[PDB]
Symmetry: C3
C-alpha cells in the first residue's frame, strides 16, 4: 500500500502525512516546510516546524492561515509594563526623525477614569522602549470629564492631535479640540540669519519650520550678535521665515551666509496651540490620522450612538492658518452600517480607508480608496464579516499590509459568538492586499502571534492598534493582556492601578521585515540594569544614589530621614510646604500614648544639652497639651508678648513665680 | 584505511568521528545529531551541535547524559533578581487559575535571619515574573525566632501552608502551624442568591467556595437588594452555601435565579486561619504538598537530627473542618537512613514520594508509591547514591518527570566528594521514569542546564526546587548563584543584603515542552521599561513621577524637599510622625558649627519679612541654645505664660526691659 | 545557456548567483553559506543567510568582510542603560576572580563635566550586568577641574588606576595620580597565623597579599585568640606576611598550623593609596594597562597637543614599593605621527602595542612588539589608514584578536570623510593577526555588529572600547548610541542628563566564542523584575516596600508623608537636618494666599483638641506674621522670658491683659 507524502499545495489534506512525519522524527528536529502552505484538519504541534504555513478551517468555509516560526521574518516585543490599563494605540503611531512613537491611553478601564494620553518611544528600531510619558494631565473638571485621543500624527514638523473631552460616567463625547505643538529637532544649517543695523530683530530662514509666535528656539554658533541660546519666535513672516528679538543692536548689517550654525526646537518648552472645535455634531470618536501635504491632514471619525451610523473623515486643508476649518467626507452609505473607527492613510495621491466591523453576524470591515480626499470612492468588502478589530495598515509597494487582532480567542470568524469572562489566547493576524487587483475575495489572514485575554472582566485590551513603517520594517503596536486578574470583581472594584498587579493590559509591537536589510545585524540581548526611570548609582560610600528630580504623589512612609545640605550654595537643608497651609503632627502612639509629643531641636540630639528645644505635647500625653520651651535665652522679637484673650490668663502662678519683671514703666492696671 | 562515521547508538565510542567532524566543519555550522545519543570519552564543543545528546562517564561506571541546544524543547529563565539570599522553592510551587506561583524564602543565609516567605508569579506561562511579595512578616519574637516554610499548596480554593517557627541561632524547629487563606477569584455566575422577606441575610450558593466566616466577598450585579459591593461571610451553611448580612430588608422574597452576576474573593482582604500544631514530635522539616481531594491533602516530612531518621508524610483528611487532625505515615524503614525532604504528589489514586539522599557514599534517593495514602508502599532505589538534591516531579502520561541539581560542580555521582569554597558550574538534570515498568536501573539523567555556585561560603542556593505542569509545559523552579561574592568572609559578615551585590542566590525556571503546542507562538522579546515595582511616568512638566504608595524603611538621605498639597481636598500639605514621639533636629555643621540652628517659618523664605519665624539655636552656635521668636503678634492661648521653675527666672532683664505690663490686677508678690 | 552557481571563493563575483538564489527561495528559509566567503558588488539581504561571510569593496581597493548570523559564534549585549553620557571603556576592562569589570566614564559630554569614573560588572559571564558604581567623586575643585581615567587594571590583588585631573573648560590635563586599592577577596586557608605569648600582635602568612598598613582584613575561624572579625593591617613584614593588633594576650604561643580558616579583604573598607605624579611632561592622556609581573605594570600614553607627537608607555617596575618611579618608553618615531591612545598587553614576555590613527588620509594604526618592555620594537602598519578607533585586543593562541568601531557610518576606509551631524549605523569590526607571520597586508576586518550614531552633535560615543578574555570567550566592551537626541541644540544646551532621554551613549559588550565550550549551556532568558537598583517587595499589607538605604540628591516633591518609628529601639520617628542650618518654610499659596501658615502640633490632627500647637502665620496671611501658641501649659525653662529689644515691646495690651503677674519681688522699673 503506497503512502502519500505532504504536498504543501494548500488543497491536499496533508494531515496524515504531517502526523506520520511528527511521529517518525525526533522532537528536537526543526521540520522545514520549505515555505509551503499545508492544509490540515486540526493544527498540529506548530512548535516543531520552521518555515511552514498551515491552512485550517476552524469554522468550515472560513480558511485562516497559521505561521510557524521563521515563516515570516518577524518578532513580537513587549513594549510597556505598567500597572495602568494600557491599551488603544489606535490609531496614533508615527515615525519622526528616526524615532518610533507608540502613543496610547493609560487608564483604569474602558473609559476616561484615571486616564492620561501617553506614549512610549523606541530609539533603536524597536528593540527597546522608553519610560512612559504623559502627554495630557487630568482635565481641570475631573472627575466629571477627562481627555481621550485616538487621532494623532505629524504635519510639517508639528504634532497634531484630536484631544476629546468625555464623561467618566458614560464615556460620552462633550468636546473636540485640535491640539498642536512643534516637534523637537536639531538643525545643522548654513547661512539664513540676517540682522539689520540699528535694530534688535533677526530674521531666520528655516524652510517649513512649522513654528508659531511664542515657540521655543535655541541657537548655537550663529555668528550673528544676540542670536544665541534659548530664545522664542517673535513673529512668523511666512512658512520659511521667522524673527527673534535679540537683546542688542549693531551699527552694521549682519548676515551669516556661508557660515555653519545650529538651531533647535522643543516640544517640551513650547505651549500647545489649542483650537476648540466644540461638540462636533454627529461624532462618536475621532480616530486615525493621514498627513496629506505640507499644509494639512485628514482624521477619521464615526458616529455610532444613534441610527444612522456615519463613517468617514474630516479633512483640514490648511491646519496651520486655519485649524478650525475642516470638511466632513463620508464613505458610501452601504458601508456605514455596523462600522466604526476607520483607519486612514495617504499614498501617492490615494486616500485609503479601512473600517472596523461591529458585528460578526453582519457585513464587516470594508476598504475604500479615493483620489479626491474622500469626495468619491471605490470600495471592497472583506469576506466573512471581519469585526471587533481596527485594521491599521501601511502601503509597501503594491500591497496594503494590514494587521488585526481578535479581542478574545475564537471571535475572528463570521458567526463566531463573543467569548468573554474566561481566559484565552486570542489570535493576531496580518494580510496583504494588492491595490492593482482590488479584490479581497481570496484574502489570506495569517496568524503570526497569539496574545492573552485575561477574562476577569468583559472588556479586552487586546489589539486595537496602530501601524508604521520605518526603513525595511513594519511595526504593529497593539494591546495584550496577561493572566493577572485586575480584581474588579474582588477587592479592587475601584480599579486602583497600584493595588496588587493592577491592570493586565500592556502594549506589544510586532516587528516584521518588509524589504531587504543590507547591513549586519544591530540586534542585542538586553543585559543592563534599566536605569532611566529611577536612575541609581552606587556612590563612593556604597549607597544607592538617585540624582534625578522626582515626584512621589502616592502616600509615603519613610524611616529615618536626613535632609542634606542642598540650597543657597549648599549652606542649608530645606523643606518647603505647599497648599494653603502645612501641618506637621504626631500620630497617637500604639504602645505608649502617654508619651505622645514632638521634640523640635536646634541641635543633634534629644538631650536639650545639644540645642534649644520646643516640645509640643499631645492630648494623649500624661501632661496633656503641655508646651515646654527650653533655651538659654527666650527672645521675643518684633511684637508684644500677649495673651490671646483679655483678662483670662496670667503671667506665672503660685508655684511658678517669675523672680521679677524688668519694665520701663509701672504696670498699667485696669 | 577505512574511517568509521559516528554511530549515535550510545555504545560505540564516537569520540574520534565527532572530533574529525568538528575539525572538518566550519565553526558556525550547527551540527545536527538527528536526535541520537553519542558515547564520548570527554564532552566535545557542545555549542556547535543541535539536536544531539551525549553519554559520558565522568566517573567510570556512572553514565550521565548531556543535551545540546534543541535536543529538548526547553529554555531556562531567570525569575528573581533581588539582593536577598533567594532560594528554597522546595517544595511549594503550584498553578492556580492560570497563574504560576513560585514561592521561596528570601533571607540572608541558610537560616531564618532576615527571612520572609515570599513568592513571585507568572501571568504569561513563564515568560515574565512579578515583583516579589512577602507572605510572612518577621516573627513577633524576632530576632530569637523567625518563620520558615517548605510546604504550600491549594486545596478547595484555599492556600494551605505549614508555617514553621525556627531559631536564628541553630535553625531548630520550635513550632508548627497550619496557615490557610482563600485564594482571590472572580466568579461569573447565574442565580444562586436568595433573600427571605423581612430579614437582612442573603444565602449565596457557590459550590466548593472554600470560605470561612469573616472572609472577604465582593458582589456585582446581584439583582438582590443589599447584596452589593464589599461584604464578608456571616455564616457558612455547608461547603456550597454561605450567608452575608445586608444593610436592609424587603417585604417580598428575593431570588436571582436565571440572572447573571459576579462574585469575588480576596486573599489580601481575608485573614489567615492559623492552627497551632505545637512542636510536632520527631520532625525536622515539613516539606512538599499533595492535594488529595476536595477535603484535604498530605505534607511531607523528615526527622534527621537524631537517630533513627524518619521520612514520610502527614495526611490531613479534612483540613476544612479539622485542620488540627492529621496522621503520620512513614516510608519503609530500609529507605529512611540518610534520607530527607520527600517530594510528594497524588495522581489517579496513587501517592508518589521521592526522597533526598544525604550522602554520596551511602544509598541515596528512593521512589515510593502507595494506593492507600502511605499505609503501604512499593519502592525503588535510584542507582548511584543520588544525593544533596530534592527530586521534585510531576506525572505526565506514564512517566514521572523529575528534576534535580547538584549544589556545586561534580558532586552528583556516587562517591564524589563535596567540592565547595571555589566557584564552579553545577549541573542540573532531569529524568523520566515509566511507572508501569517500575525500574530505575537504567534511568537516564539528562543535563539540560548549568548553574553557578559562587564559592564564597560553603552553602549553596543552587537547586532544591519545585515542579509544576501548566498545559503542555513543565516548569522546574530552582535556585542558582552568580560570581558575586556576598563578602561573608570580608566586609559583610553581618550578611546585610543591601551592601554591595548582596547575596548571589536567585531563582530560575526551566520551562520544558511536554506535549504538543497547537497554537502559534506567544513568545515575545521583553523591550519595556519594567514599571511595576516603582511605577514612573514622565509628567507633563518632564519630571519622573511615581503615583504608587510606597514605604522606604532603610535610612534615607534627601536633598531639597517640597511637601505638596495632598490632604483634605488638597487644602494642606501634611507630615505625620509616628512612634511614642517625633524628633526634628539639626546635625552639627561640618564647616560652620557656630551657625548651627533651624529656622521654622510660616512663609516662603529665610527672611523674616516672608513670615513669622521661630529659630532654635544649637548648642554649638555662638549664641548657644538661644531661641528667637519673631512675629508681628505673639499670642499665648489657652494657658498662663509661666516659668518652668519657681522663682528662678525673670520677665525681661536690665538690657531687655518690657515697656510695661498690661494687667487686670496688681502683681501678686510673695 | 549555462548558469553559474555561487563559488564562495572570495574572488569570483557571486552577486548574480546569490541574487538568483534569493529570488528563487522562500523568504523564511535560512540560506546556509557553508562557512564560505562570497564576493559581492553590493551587500545583499544579509538577514536571510546563516553561516555566510561576504567580501565587499564599498570603496574600490578596500575589501572588508561582513558576517551573517551564525558565521561567528557571538552575540551583542547592551550592558548600561543610564541617562549619563556613558562611553570610553578605553582601555580599562579586566577580569578578577571570575567577575568581568567594564569600567567607563559617565559624564554629560566629551569632557569631564558631571563625570564619574564608573563601572558595571558581570557575575554570569556577560549575560547580565550590575547597577553602575561610581569609583570617583566630583573633584574637590569642581567645576574648574574634574577626574578622568583611561588606564586601569590589577597587579598582585590591587586595582591600579591613573586618575587624571582635567579642566572642564578645555579638557586639558592638569595632574596625574596613581590610585590603588586592594581588591575584595575571600580566602580559605590552612595554617599561617602565629601569635607570640605575652604580646598582642599576630602574624598572618598570606602569599602575595597585596595589602598595605591600614587596609581592611576580616577573620573567621582563625583558632587564634583575638584574631577575629573586622581588623586592619598594623604592619607589613614582606610581600607574604603582615601583622594585626589583637585586643589581648595569652601566656602561651599560638599557631593555627593545620587548621582551616577564612580571611577576607575589602575594596570598599580600604582607602585609596594616592601617589601624586604631578603634571607629567609631554602627556595628553594615559591609556591602557598591561600587568607585567608580581611587582608592576605598564600604562600607555600619547602626547598629541603639540608637535611632535609622542606615543609609548610608562613602565612602573615596582609599583608596590615605588609607585612614583616609572620609565618612559616611546615607539619608533616613524609610527608616532597622527597616532594616539595605544592599547598595550603583555603575553609570554612580549609587550604588544597597537595605536589609534587620527586621520583617514595619513598612515594609521600600527602594531608593535617588544621583548624588553618597550626599549626596542618590531613594527607593522595596518593597511588603509585605520583611524578614529582604538584597537583593544587579546592574544589567543598564535593570534592577536582585535576589535574596533568606526564612530559614524562609512568612516572606516582610507580617504573616507567624516560623516557627522546625521543619524547612521556605524560598523564594528574584529580581526585576527597571526604573530608568527607578522604581516598585516592581508588582514581581514570582519563586520560583526552595527551600532547607532545619533547625529545630534558632532561627537560620537560609539566604540573606543576595551577587551578581555574569560575562559573560552572574548569580550569587547564599547560604546553605542540610539536615536534619542540629547537636545544640546534644543532645550538642553546645559546637557542635564535627567531631562528628557538624557544622553544616548551607553555601553555594549560583544561576547565571542574563541575556544571549545565543554559544558551544557548556562544561557537564560531574563524574566525577572530587576530588583537590585531599587529593591522593592510587596509587604504583607500590599504596599511596595524598599528596605535599602538610599540617597535622593535631586529635587524631590512628596505628597502625604508619614515618618515611621525608626530610631532608638524604634521609640521615635526622626528627621535630622544638615548644613549650617535647616529651614522649614511655607510656599505662597496659589489659590488662598490669605491662609498662608504652618500648624505644628504635638497631636494627630489640625484641631488643637488633639495636641499643643504653634502656628506660624505667613506674611501673606490676613493676620500677617502672627504667631499663636496654643497649649494647656506654656512653660519657659532654663532662661528668662525677654523681649529681643530694650524698652520697645510690652507684656500684654489694652485688649489683651494678663489677669496678674506672679512674682517673687516687685517689678524693677527704670
Ligand atoms: C486647620 C485649622 O486652622 N485648624 C484650627 C482650628 C479651626 O480654625 C477651627 O476648628 C474652625 O474651623 O481651630 C483651632 O483648633 C482652635 O480654635 O483651637 C486650632 C486649629 O489650628
Amino acid at each position: 500500500v503506497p503512502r502519500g507524502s505532504a504536498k504543501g499545495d494548500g488543497v491536499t489534506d496533508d494531515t496524515a502525512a504531517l502526523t506520520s512525519a511528527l511521529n517518525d522524527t525526533p522532537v528536537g528536529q526543526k521540520i522545514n516546510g520549505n515555505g509551503k502552505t499545508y492544509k490540515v484538519t486540526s493544527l498540529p504541534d506548530i512548535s516543531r516546524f520552521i518555515n511552514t504555513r498551515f491552512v485550517y478551517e476552524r469554522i468550515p468555509g472560513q480558511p485562516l492561515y497559521y505561521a510557524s516560526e521563521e515563516f515570516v521574518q518577524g518578532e513580537l516585543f513587549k513594549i510597556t509594563d505598567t500597572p495602568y490599563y494600557n491599551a488603544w494605540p489606535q490609531d496614533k503611531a508615527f515615525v519622526y526623525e528616526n524615532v518610533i512613537y507608540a502613543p496610547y491611553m493609560g487608564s483604569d478601564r474602558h473609559g476616561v477614569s484615571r486616564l492620561h494620553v501617553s506614549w512610549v518611544k523606541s530609539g533603536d528600531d524597536g528593540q527597546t522602549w522608553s519610560t512612559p510619558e504623559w502627554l495630557t494631565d487630568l482635565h481641570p473638571d475631573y472627575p466629571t470629564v477627562n481627555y481621550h485621543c485616538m487621532s494623532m500624527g505629524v504635519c510639517r514638523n508639528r504634532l497634531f492631535a484630536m484631544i476629546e473631552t468625555r464623561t467618566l460616567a458614560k464615556n460620552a463625547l462633550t468636546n473636540c479640540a485640535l491640539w498642536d505643538r512643534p516637534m523637537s529637532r536639531s538643525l545643522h544649517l548654513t547661512g539664513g540669519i540676517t540682522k539689520a543695523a540699528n535694530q534688535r530683530y533677526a530674521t531666520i530662514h528655516v524652510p517649513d519650520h512649522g513654528l508659531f509666535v511664542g515657540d521655543f528656539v535655541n541657537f548655537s554658533n550663529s555668528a550673528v550678535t544676540g542670536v544665541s541660546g534659548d530664545m522664542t519666535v517673535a513673529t512668523v513672516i511666512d512658512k520659511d521665515n521667522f524673527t527673534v528679538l535679540t537683546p542688542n543692536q549693531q551699527t552694521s548689517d549682519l548676515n551669516n551666509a556661508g557660515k555653519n550654525w545650529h538651531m533647535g526646537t522643543s516640544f517640551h518648552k513650547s505651549p500647545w496651540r489649542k483650537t476648540d472645535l466644540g461638540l462636533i455634531p454627529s461624532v462618536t470618536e475621532v480616530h486615525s490620522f493621514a498627513t496629506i501635504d505640507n499644509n494639512g491632514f485628514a482624521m477619521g471619525y464615526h458616529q455610532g450612538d444613534v441610527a444612522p451610523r456615519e463613517v468617514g473623515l474630516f479633512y483640514f486643508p490648511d491646519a496651520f492658518n486655519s485649524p478650525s476649518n475642516y470638511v466632513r467626507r463620508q464613505i458610501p452609505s452601504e458601508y456605514e452600517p455596523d462600522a466604526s473607527e476607520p483607519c486612514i492613510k495617504y499614498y501617492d495621491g490615494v486616500l485609503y480607508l479601512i473600517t472596523r466591523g461591529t458585528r460578526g453576524d453582519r457585513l464587516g470591515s470594508s476598504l475604500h480608496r479615493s483620489r479626491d480626499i474622500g469626495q468619491t470612492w471605490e470600495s471592497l468588502r472583506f469576506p466573512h464579516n471581519v469585526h471587533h478589530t481596527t485594521l491599521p495598515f501601511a502601503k509597501v509597494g503594491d500591497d496594503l499590509i494590514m494587521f488585526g487582532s481578535e479581542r478574545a480567542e475564537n471571535e475572528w470568524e463570521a458567526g463566531a459568538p463573543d467569548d468573554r469572562y474566561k481566559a484565552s489566547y486570542p489570535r493576531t493576524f496580518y494580510a496583504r492586499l494588492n491595490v492593482n487587483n482590488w479584490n479581497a475575495d481570496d484574502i489570506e489572514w495569517v496568524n503570526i502571534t497569539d496574545q492573552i485575554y485575561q477574562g476577569g472582566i468583559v472588556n479586552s485590551g487586546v489589539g486595537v492598534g496602530s501601524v508604521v513603517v520605518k526603513d525595511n520594517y513594519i511595526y504593529y503596536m497593539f494591546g495584550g493582556e496577561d493572566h493577572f486578574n485586575p480584581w474588579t470583581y474582588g477587592d479592587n472594584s475601584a480599579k486602583d492601578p497600584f493595588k496588587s498587579d493592577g491592570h493586565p493590559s500592556d502594549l506589544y509591537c510586532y516587528k516584521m521585515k518588509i524589504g531587504p536589510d543590507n547591513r549586519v545585524s544591530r540586534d542585542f540581548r538586553y543585559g543592563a540594569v534599566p536605569n532611566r526611570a529611577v536612575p541609581v548609582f552606587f556612590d563612593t560610600n556604597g549607597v544607592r544614589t538617585v540624582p534625578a528630580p522626582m515626584e512621589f504623589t502616592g502616600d509615603l512612609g519613610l524611616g529615618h530621614v536626613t535632609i542634606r545640605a542642598s540650597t543657597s550654595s549648599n549652606i542649608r537643608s530645606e523643606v518647603l510646604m505647599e497648599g494653603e497651609y502645612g501641618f506637621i503632627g504626631k500620630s497617637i502612639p500604639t504602645d505608649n500614648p502617654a508619651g505622645q509629643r514632638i521634640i523640635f531641636c536646634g541641635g543633634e540630639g534629644t538631650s536639650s544639652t545639644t540645642g534649644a528645644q520646643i516640645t509640643l505635647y499631645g492630648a494623649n500625653n500624661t501632661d496633656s497639651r503641655r508646651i515646654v520651651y527650653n533655651g538659654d535665652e527666650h527672645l521675643f522679637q518684633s511684637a508684644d508678648v500677649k495673651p490671646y484673650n483679655d483678662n483670662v490668663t496670667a503671667l506665672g502662678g503660685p508655684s511658678n513665680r517669675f523672680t521679677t519683671a524688668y519694665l520701663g514703666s509701672n504696670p498699667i492696671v485696669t
